[PDB]
DNA sequence: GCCGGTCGACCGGC
DNA sequence: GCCGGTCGACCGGC
């Protein structure tokens, strides 16, 4: 992680900070801005990242060509836009943001990538652990890590930003965590909720003590297990209760 | 539908005015200017139903005000929020709310939900309403035998950024309970949500509401079964080889 | 404490 | 044409 080193300054900086008001999504703008002010050469929005990468090789055109530019089936898988969209990319037609992009920020250096996703959170309101990342996307991710044996390329990390309403919104606190540093098997997969791993960064454990490859293998086990179970529970929850009306 | 008659009226004005989109607010206005009398935001309606009965208090009691195991289900905000309600502590908008707009007149409820559709970006049908919520609804409907109480209608609002702002391009209007059930797409991963564009929605169903519920339920059961099988093939067969 | 449903609308593979 | 996964968080029942 490139950002733990200065997490305290981030912490201190953000705590206090305020934003306008019509959820606290725009708090991420500040993270990016701050990160942009103390890690300039490592910080990109994910679209911003693709852009630079496609600008650096203006001759490489066409999506299959541009895809080769990643040098990593896995990173290829997490950061890249679609074929047509890769096809039609151009200096006059840059990538813009996209709800469904994996990361909110990339910190990259010496060909190591940190994918930062910023979970905002209204602590005054209830406490509903939010979507973290797709369980299925995380699974395909692991398969690739083994299949290409890319176990020392990137990490997925989270920066919670707590805030509350005050006349203006203001961050009262923040947490930070590392995905690949948590227990694969304790991860809560919410299937209906777009199959999203769900937790509060605050409460995420970091006691994991094995290799990255092991982690992938343990996650894939958890996933498959929960997948089998879910298939079964659907009969109970979704069929059984309604057979009677037929 | 208290909308269908004046659909022409609505449509006409909608096209050409500007403002994720949120013309949802726009339309409300029209319906308020022209129907201020049976036009509520869902939550607004609730303050009204609660303001108009200052005697009844606590939740157990306040739900009787719905006089409907079904509307209750679809409209209620739930024990604690309801218990804690009072004129100095009114409901606000809740992301979770079933409806965007509510037209109720002579004890018939029209549950309206607009769908904004960036018509320039993609043809990605949006979530229309959780299929499982709907199941529960149909079940209640059946049970409590209340087929002539409420409609769930949609009104699409297309748009593009042809200018400094967005801009409505055109609209559409369908009725969930006029569609063929067995035909509705249930995207399980997407919050178990029925997905469609209003413009493409079949409106050719000619049975009883009782029939519609019975058919929709069969469709749900069938589709819940295939999804469970889909999971094995999609999220189990392909990864077993890594363990 | 524990658990999992809902709104919102969004591409892109073949 | 046919399909369906993804980000965003967010509530209440026992
Ligand atoms: Ca985020
Ligand atoms: Ca809506
Ligand atoms: Na809906």
């Amino acid at each position: 992680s490139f950002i733990k080193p200065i997490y305290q300054d981030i912490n201190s900086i953000l705590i206090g900070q305020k934003v306008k008001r019509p959820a606290g999504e725009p708090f991420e703008k500040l993270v990016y801005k701050f990160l942009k002010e103390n890690l300039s050469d490592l910080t990109f929005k994910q679209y911003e990242y693709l852009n630079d990468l496609f600008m650096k090789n203006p001759a490489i055109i066409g999506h299959e060509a541009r895809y080769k530019l990643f040098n990593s089936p896995t990173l290829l898988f997490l950061l890249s836009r679609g074929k047509a969209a890769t096809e039609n990319w151009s200096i006059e037609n840059l990538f813009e943001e996209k709800q469904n992009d994996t990361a909110d920020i990339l910190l990259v250096k010496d060909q190591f990538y940190e994918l930062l996703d910023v979970k905002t959170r209204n602590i005054s309101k209830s406490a509903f652990a939010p979507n973290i990342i797709s369980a299925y996307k995380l699974a395909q991710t692991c398969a690739k890590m083994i299949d290409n044996k890319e176990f020392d390329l990137f990490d997925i990390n989270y920066l919670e930003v707590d805030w509350e309403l005050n006349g203006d919104l203001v961050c009262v606190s923040t947490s930070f965590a590392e995905l690949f540093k948590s227990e694969p098997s304790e991860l809560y997969i919410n299937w209906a909720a777009a199959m999203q791993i769900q937790f509060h960064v605050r409460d995420l454990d970091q006691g994991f003590n094995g290799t990255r490859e092991e982690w992938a293998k343990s996650y894939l086990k958890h996933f498959v297990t929960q997948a089998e179970q879910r298939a079964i529970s659907m009969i109970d929850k979704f069929v059984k209760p309604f057979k009677k009306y037929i």
Side-chain angles (χ1 to χ4, degrees), chain A residues 22-24 26-28 30-32 34-39 41:
Chain A
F27 269 106
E28 181 265 335
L30 286 170
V31 181
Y32 174 69
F34 166 92
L35 272 166
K36 206 76 207 56
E37 283 166 16
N38 286 281
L39 292 174
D41 291 333

Side-chain angles (χ1 to χ4, degrees), chain A residues 22 61 197-198:
Chain A
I61 293 187
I197 303 285
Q198 279 176 347

Side-chain angles (χ1 to χ4, degrees), chain A residues 21-24 26-28 30-32 34-39 41-63 65-67 69-98 100-108 110 112-124 126-148 150-163 165-167 169-185 187-216 218-220 222-228:
Chain A
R21 175 261 212 89
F27 269 106
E28 181 265 335
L30 286 170
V31 181
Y32 174 69
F34 166 92
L35 272 166
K36 206 76 207 56
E37 283 166 16
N38 286 281
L39 292 174
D41 291 333
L42 298 72
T43 303
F44 322 74
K45 309 279 320 165
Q46 176 186 326
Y47 64 82
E48 191 202 329
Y49 178 79
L50 297 179
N51 280 345
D52 296 351
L53 182 73
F54 298 170
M55 281 177 36
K56 283 158 149 181
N57 334 250
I60 271 42
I61 293 187
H63 68 258
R66 279 165 180 180
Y67 283 161
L69 277 177
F70 280 83
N71 292 324
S72 177
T74 316
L75 253 14
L76 193 271
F77 176 65
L78 286 174
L79 309 171
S80 92
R81 303 277 181 80
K83 294 166 174 292
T86 296
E87 195 59 33
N88 307 142
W89 175 94
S90 140
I91 189 71
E92 310 110 26
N93 186 46
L94 293 179
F95 293 131
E96 244 91 21
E97 191 202 21
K98 214 197 194 55
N100 82 141
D101 275 334
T102 322
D104 286 348
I105 324 252
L106 296 192
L107 295 318
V108 8
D110 284 313
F112 200 85
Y113 298 70
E114 184 192 12
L115 286 58
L116 190 63
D117 172 1
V118 173
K119 309 281 94 187
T120 73
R121 174 192 181 172
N122 182 352
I123 60 84
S124 36
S126 48
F128 210 153
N131 305 339
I132 288 313
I133 199 184
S134 168
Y136 177 50
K137 173 187 294 203
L138 184 43
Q140 303 185 72
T141 294
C142 293
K144 280 138 156 69
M145 299 188 64
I146 329 291
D147 275 349
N148 313 296
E150 332 182 16
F151 315 102
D152 300 288
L153 201 52
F154 67 91
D155 313 307
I156 311 325
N157 306 314
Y158 293 90
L159 164 63
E160 166 172 6
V161 294
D162 292 310
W163 55 275
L165 155 67
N166 268 322
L169 283 45
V170 29
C171 161
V172 310
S173 61
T174 83
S175 322
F176 178 79
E178 306 191 52
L179 172 63
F180 292 126
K181 198 154 174 278
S182 65
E183 177 51 46
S185 74
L187 256 14
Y188 181 84
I189 299 163
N190 193 339
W191 299 101
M195 328 197 276
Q196 296 276 313
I197 303 285
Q198 279 176 347
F199 59 64
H200 294 276
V201 177
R202 209 185 281 179
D203 324 351
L204 188 82
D205 61 286
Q206 303 280 322
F208 184 77
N209 311 132
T211 72
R212 172 64 40 86
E213 178 195 21
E214 295 181 330
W215 204 101
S218 169
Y219 173 74
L220 283 179
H222 182 40
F223 189 76
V224 168
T225 306
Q226 299 318 308
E228 283 162 352

